[model samples]
Target: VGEGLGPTADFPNGRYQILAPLGSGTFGKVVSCWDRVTEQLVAVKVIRAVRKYAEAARMEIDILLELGRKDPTSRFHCVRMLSYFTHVSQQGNAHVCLVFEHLGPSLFDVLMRNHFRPLPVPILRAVARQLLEAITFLHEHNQIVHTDIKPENVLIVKSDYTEERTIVNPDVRLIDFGSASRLDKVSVRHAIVSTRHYRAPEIILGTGWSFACDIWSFGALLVECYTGQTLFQSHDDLEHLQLMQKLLQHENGEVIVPPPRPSPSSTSMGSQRRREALKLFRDGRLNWPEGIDEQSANSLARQKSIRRVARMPELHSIFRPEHACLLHLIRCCLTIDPLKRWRPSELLRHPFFMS
Candidate 1:
C-alpha cells in the first residue's frame, strides 16, 4: 500500500474511502475519495436536488450519458467515470454521487496563481489550441453543446502544474458536463447553464441558441486569459450587458466603425427563432416576467449587447488573426440573430485555430 494513503473513516471499505471536499457548484459539492483496490484517487460529486432542475437532475444525467456515447476519440473516457451511488447528505435529503478519476486543480486556479502577471504568448496559444480541440470534438458528434465552458471547467490531471505546461503543446481535459446534451432542431431549452460572464449574446436574447454558443464562451475565455480579467464580469443580466458594452466600446448605437452585413448564421428556424426573439422583445413572452420584457428595452438591450464586443482588446496572442477575426468572430457567434452564428466546423478553420 502507498504510504500516507489509506481509506478514510467515512468509507472503511478502503477501496472507496472518502476524503476532504474538493469544490462546489450551483448543483452540488465535490469531494475527494480514495480507491484502495486500484491504488488511485477519484472525485465524487454529490448533487442535492433543489429547485426544478434539482428535482429532475436532468442536466447532470444528460451531460454524463451523452459524453459517454458521443466522444469518438473517447476523450470522455480519458477523463473517466467509475461509478455512481445515492446517499443522504448532512442536509437530510437524498443526493446523487458521480464518481470519476482524481484530477488536479482547475484552469481557474492555475490562472489565478500564474496569470496575475502577463504570461508568455506561446502559453496562451497552447491553451487555446487544446480548448479548440475539446470544443471541436464535442461539436462533431451532435452532443449538443457545452454552454458553460470556462476555466473552472477545465482541469489539469497532473499533481504538479509545471510538469503539464504545454508551451509548445499543452494538454487540457474538459471537465464538468453538467450543461452538455444531445440536441437538434425543434428542441430549445430555457435553462441557462453557463457562468454569467461567458454566456453568448444569442443566449441572452433567447434566440433558440445551440452549439455556436460554446464558441462565444471560448472567445470570452480567451479574452480573460489574455487580459487577466473577465470580458464580461457582471453578476446581474442588466449589469452584465452594460459591462460587455463597455469592453466593446459602443458608439452611436453601433458596434464597429461600420457594421458588417448580417449573415445566415444568426437567423434561426427560417428566421422563426429570430422573429420570436424580436417578438419577445416587442410583445414579451408569457414565460418572461412582465417588467423584464415590458417594452423595447429588452430588444434594444440585445442589439447593444452584440455590438458591445467592439471594444475587446486584440486576441491575436491567444487566437491567430484571420481577416477581420476574433472580435468579429465573437460578434458573429454572439449575434442576436442565431442563424448568423458560425458553426463549430467553421470555427475550427478560423484564423484563431490556424496555429
Candidate 2:
C-alpha cells in the first residue's frame, strides 16, 4: 500500500495516524497525517530508506532547519519544518520521515488544470512579491541557492479554486530544500540541478552556478505565469540555448548582447566544460543551427523554417503599460551575465511589485 506505512505506526512523540497520501516522487511518498500531540493535520514525506534517498532527506532537513531557525512561522514564505522522525518498515528497513506544514497544489497543477492559460495580473504580482521575499531570505540571509525554481517548487499557501487556471493563493511558500545549495559551498560542476525548462544557461554551458542561477529560473517561471507557455521549451541543451538567445534579444530593449569573442586562448584557459561553452559561439553570434546540422546529420528540424524559435518578443506581446513592467523585471532576472543579473533583494525593489 503506502510504502508499508499505515495508521498503526506509533512514534515516541505521539501516534501519527495516516490520513491519506498526498503526493509521491523519486525521493519518497508524501502523506497527510493527523498529529495527536498537536491535534493538527500535517504533511509527512516518508523517504524510502534507500541509501541515497535517506542521505538526501537528511541534507534537506539540515537546509530546512537553517532556513527556519530564524523564522519558523512562515514569515519568510519559506516552508517550515515542523518535526521529523525515522520509522522502520515491517521488513526491517529504516525510513526518514519529515513532517512539514501542509500547503496546497503547486502553480504547475493550477496552470495545467486551466489548460495553460495565464493567471490574473494581481495574482501573479502577489506571487512575485512572495517568491522574491522568500528568495531574498534564502540568498541574502542564508547564502542559499534553490538551484531549482519552477512553478512546481513554489506552492500555493491556500488555494480555493475551480477548474479555472490560477496558481496564486495571493500567498505561497518556496518548498523543497532537496536541491538547495549554499552560494559559498557550490563549485562548478556538470551535475544538473533544475527541471529542464527552468534550468539556467550557466548550468547548461557549465559556466558555473550562483544565486543568479536561480534568478534565471525565477524569471523563466514568471514568464510561464505571464504567457502560460515555457519560454524555453526544449529537452536538448543546444535548442535550450537557442531559445534563450532568441528570448533575450528584444528590438525594444535592443540591449542585445553579442556572443563573447571565441578566442582560441579563451578555450585553452579553463576546463573542458568552459571550452565547450565557448565553442557554442563563433564570431559574434551563436553557432546553433550550423552546429546542430553538423552534429545530428540531416536532422529535418535543422531547416530554417522548421527550426523551433521563441516568439520574437512581439508575441510576448505588449499587453499594457503595467504588464510592460513585468517584461522589465523578466529581462533583469534573465540577464545573460550572472554578474549583472538582479539579486533577489534587489529584484524585490523592482517597480512591478512596488507600486
Candidate 3:
C-alpha cells in the first residue's frame, strides 16, 4: 500500500520523509511525515494548486503564522504551524504545503470509535472548557472568527497521562482554520461558511454574521459532544432552517411569538414581546387552521408530547445533576439571537466553570 503513496520527492525542500497518508479532502491530502531536520513527527497538509483552494491554503498559512508569532510556543489549544513552502508537481501544478505539530485524532474520530455514544459528563466538561478558552483567545485577543467549529475540527492533545487521568481532564485543541477570517474581513466571505449541522441560524438567513456565528456552531457542537449526534441534521437550506427552528423550540420549550399590540387609548405598553408571546401561545387562545377538528387537535397534541419527551433527554438520566450548570451554559450558548449569545469570555466566567 505504501508503494507510491508518499509525497513526491519534489515536496518542498525535501526536508521531510512521508510516512503515510493521513487523510484527503477537497483541498488537499494530509500525510504523516518524519522531519529529518527536527527528527520529529509532523503532519504536512499538501494543498492542491486549484486557484480557489490554493488561495485558501495560503490564507491558512498566513493565519497560522500570525497566530504562531503572537503565541509562539503553542500556549493555547490552536494548532501550531511549524513551517510552510510551495512545491510544483511534474504536471506543473503548484501545491502549498503546511507543516503542523502532529496531534491525536479529532473529537469526531473519538465519537466514531465509541459507536457514537455520548461522552461522560466530566469529559464533556473538559472539552467544552478547553474549546471555550481556545475560542476566547481567537475572538478577543486575535480578533478572528473560527467560522467553522465542529467535532471534526476539535482534537485532544496526546499525553503520557493515563487514560483515567485524561478522561476527565483531557487537553483538547481546535484545528482547521481554513475557514477562519479576521473579524473585519468577514464581510467579504460567504454567509454559508460552516458545516450544515453546526451552521448558525443568522448565516442561514443571510442577514449578516460575525463572531456570534462561531458561538452558534459551538453550541451545536456541545450538544453533539453530549448526545453523540448533531442537534440539527439537515441536507438542504430549507430543511436546515426547519431543523434549527425545531431545535430552538424543542430544547428549551420556548417559541418565538410576536407580542400583542397596545390599545389605541393606552400609552402604557406590555413588557418585552417575547414573554407575552410565550404566555399567549401557552393559553391556546390562538385559533387553529379552519378545517381542524377536536380529534385532529388531540392527535397533534399527542404527537408533540411524544416528540418532546423523546427530545428532552434528562441531563440527570444521561449525565448527572451536578452538571446542571453545564446544561445552563449550553442554553446560553444556543440562544438564537446573536446579541443574546454568550461570548467565550462570558462563558468562561459561567458558574459551571467556577464549579
Candidate 4:
C-alpha cells in the first residue's frame, strides 16, 4: 500500500510541532499542528503522491485560489488558505501539503454524534443563508457552481465558549470545492456532479442545464435543514426521477390525472407560450393551462395559488421588493431555455443580497 498513511509522532521541524491525525483518505492523512510562526493551531491536508492524481490535486489548488481571491468573507465562511508546500516522497512521487485554519468537528461528525436531531433553526438559518449568499456571489462574480453541497461538506468554527470552556456552538462554513465548475467554461451537457438527493432534476435528466441547478439543490438543502431528513427517500435513480415528476408535476408518476392538453380555446398558444408553459410546468409554477380533462392537471396550480396568497405576506416580508430581484434572477437562470440563463455578474444586482 501507500506510505504517510498513519498518525505521526515525529515533529518534522523540531521547532514547529505536530499533534495527531485528524482524518485519513486514500492518498494521505490530515493532521493538526502548531504553527511556530503564527503561534496558532492549524490543520494540514497532506497528500502523498503514491497513487498519482496530479491533475486532481492541481484543480483543488486552483479552486481555493480562485475562491480566495473572489470571496470577501472567504476566510470566515471557508477554510482560509494559509499556504502550500511540496516535497518528494520516498516513492519518488510528490507530496503536497495545504495549510488551513483549524476547524472543529465537521457538521457530518456532529450530526452523526447527535443522531441528527432538531438542530436549532436559527443556527440552520444562519448557516443556510450564508451558504446561499456565498453560492450566489460565486455565480455572479466567478460563474463558479459548487456541485457538492451536503452536510459532510459543511464545517463549523467556534464563535464563543461555554462555562466548561468547551468551544461553543458555531455557524456553518461551506468547504471542499473540488467538484465545482465554472458555468461559463463548461457545457450544459455533462454528467451530474452532486450527491444523491441533492442533485437537481435537469442534471438527473441529462438535459441541458446551467447554474440554476445549484438553486434546485439549495431547495433540497432547505428541506434537509428544516426537517433533518431527506426531502425524497427514493432508493434508486428511477424512483428518484418518479419523485421529481410528482414534485414537479411533469411526467411519469401516479396518474394524478392524465397529463393535460392545452385547449385551443385557451387564452391562445404560440411557440413561446408553449415553451413558457412547459417550463412553468417543470418548475411547478402556479398557473393552470386551460382545458384539461385531467382533474389533477390544474390541481397543483390551485393549491399553489392558495398557498401563495396565504404565505405571500410572510414571503414578501422575508424577500422584500428589493429582494424580488433574486426571484427574477433565479427564474432567468432556471429557465428551461438554455439561452435564458442569467450570467452571474448580471445577477449581482439581485435584491436578495444585503448589499
Candidate 5:
C-alpha cells in the first residue's frame, strides 16, 4: 500500500475518507477523498474556519450552484460541484469542505510541462473559442462576473499527455469563483480583484468595472499561452498599465493612456475610484510623467523600462501574418476603455474563429 501524509478526518455523514493531501494548506486545501457512498475518488476543497473565509466559501457555493444548476447540458466549461457540507472539528473550527468533480491539472500546470515553450496559434484559437463559450455562459446565463480568469483557473479535461505534447483537443474548464459577484454588485464592490498580471485597467484605477474586466484577463491569458511568457510582468500596478500601453495601441483613440474619454466630465465619477483617478489628473489632462513629481518617478521608470529594453517586440516580428486576426481579437479585448472592450460572445464571431 502506498503511504500518505496529512490530516485524516471523518465527515458527520461518514461517507468520505481523506485519502491524502493533493494540495493542502492553511487558508484552504484540496484533498483526495474516497466517497464511501458512490465508491468514487473525488477532490474535496477544505476551506478555512475563519469568519470571512467561511462566508466567502458559502458565497462561492452560491455561484457554483448558479453554474451547475443552469448548465444542464454542460455547454459551459465550468468545473462541477458534486456536493458540499460543513465539518466542525474538535478544535472548534467550522471548516467548509466542498466536494467537487475531480479534474485534471490546471492549464498553468500543462504549460509548465511544455517547459514554457509557446503553443501554436491554432491551439490558442481552439482554447480561446471554448473559453469564450464558457464566458458567455457566465455573463449571459448566470449574469455573474468571474472577476478572476487566468491559466491557473483553467483545467484540462484530459490529464494524459501524448509523447510529442502538442495537444489537439484543448478541452478545459474554468474554475475559481471566490472573487466573483453578480453584475449588479461588482461595480459597487470597491475591493481589488484578479491576479496581478491578469488585472484589468479599471481594477488598477480603482474605477468601477464590469464583465469587460474579465475580457481583459481573457486577453492576457491568450497572450501568455501563445508567447509562453506573461503579457505584462510587473511589481506595481502603475507599471502593469505601462506594460499594457507598450503592447496595446488604440488606433481609433487619440492616445491610448486612458483613451479619448467621453470627456471625464460626462457620465464619469461613476465610482469612488474614478474620482481618485481624476484626482491624479493635471487639470484637463491626466497627471502623467511630467505633470507630477515622485509620481513621475514611478510612472517615468516604467515608461523608459519598456522603451529602452524593447521589452515588447514588434507584433509582426513575433506573430506571423497568418495569425493577424487573432492578434486583432486580443487587441479588442485589451482595449484601454472597458466599455470599448469586446464581450466574450461578440469575440466568438471574430474572423479569427472562422479560420
Candidate 6:
C-alpha cells in the first residue's frame, strides 16, 4: 500500500485526512482532503481562528449553506457546499472548516493554459451566459451582492472541456463568497470589498453601492475574458478611476470630466452650473462635447498626467466587427455611473444573449 505524507497537525478531527494544500488567502488555506465518512475526496477550506476573521468565516458559511438549500441543481451552477464544522488547532485557536465539492481549475487557470490568448467568442459567450445567470440569481432571487466577481473567483467544472459544442458548453461556477453581502444589510463588514482591477466606481469612491456593483465587475470580467487582459490595470483606486474616466470618454465619443464631490453650494453660480453639467453626465442626459473644454488648464494637465505609455486599446481592436453588439453590452456594464448601468437581469435579455 502507498502511504500518504501523513496528515498535517492542522487537521486533527480524524474525520478528514489532509492531503495537500490547494491554495491560501488572507483568511485561510484550502487543502485537498479525504473524507472518512463518505470515503470521497473533497476540498476543505480551513479558515484561521483569529477573532477578526471568525465572523466573516461564519458569514460565508451561512451564505453557502443558504445557497445550497435554495438551489440544489441551479442552471447557473453555483458551487455547492457539502458540509462544514469547527476545528481547533494544536495551538488551541478555533478554525472553521468548510467542505466543498471538488472542482477543476479557476477561470484564470484556464486562461493561462490558453497561453494568455483571448478566448474564442463562442467560449466567451458561454461563460458570460453562465456568469450572468449566476449573478442574476444572486441579485433577483437571493438579494445578495457578490462584491467580488473577478476571473479568479469563477471556476470551470472540469479540465477537458471544449467550446465546439457551443450550445452545450462545459459548466462554470461562481465561488468564494467571502466578500458577498446581503442587500438588506445597513453596512458590510469588509473594509475593501473587491479586487483592485475589477472593483466598481462606487466602491472606489466609498459612495453607497448596491447590486449594480457586481454588474460593473462583471463588465470588467467580460473584457478580460475576451482579451485575456484586465480592462482597468491600476495600482490604486485613484488610478483605477482615471482609467475608467479615459475608457468612458473613448467609448462614448466624448470627454468626461470628473464630477464635483457632493458638496454644499460653493462661491459662484457658474461653479454650480459646472456641478449641474457633471450631474447631467451622471444622469445620462448630457450632449456630446458639452464639457470637453470647460475645465481649466490645470485640469487638462492633470488629465494628461494620467496618460499611459501606450494608448488604450479601442473596442474594435479587441473585439471583432461581428461582436459590435457584444461591445455594446460591455459598454452598458462599464457605465461609469452605476445608476445608468445595466442590471444583470436586464442584461440577460440583451441581443448578445438572445441567440
TM-score between model 5 and native: 0.83
Off by over 4 Å in 1: 1-15, 49-59, 69-78, 88-92, 159-169, 185-187, 242-337, 351-354
Clashes of 4: 1
For candidate 4, which ten residues in a row score worst on lDDT?
A: 250-259
lDDT, candidate 6, 204-252, per-residue tens: 5444568888998999898998888878876544445556666766665
Local accuracy by lDDT, each model: 0.58, 0.75, 0.70, 0.55, 0.72, 0.71
| Cα RMSD to the true fold for all candidates | 8.1, 3.9, 8.1, 10.6, 4.5, 6.9
Number of the candidate with higher TM-score, 1 or 5? 5
lDDT string for model 3 (85-119, tens) is: 77666677778888889866788877887788887
Clashes of each: 13, 0, 0, 1, 0, 0
Residues 74-191 of candidate 1 have per-residue lDDT tens digits of: 4532245566666554456667667777766776877776654444555666666666767776776555677779888877665333434533344567777766765655356544
Candidate 2 displacement at residue 313 in angstroms: 4.6
* Predicted candidate 5 versus true structure: per-residue lDDT over 276-305, tens digit per residue: 554444555544344434555567664565
Name the better of 2 and 3 by TM-score: 2
Comparing 3 and 5 on TM-score, the stronger one: 5
Candidate with the greatest TM-score versus the true structure: 2
TM-score for each prediction? 0.68, 0.85, 0.77, 0.62, 0.83, 0.79
Please report how far candidate 2 places residue 18 from its true position, in Å.
2.4
Candidate topping lDDT: 2
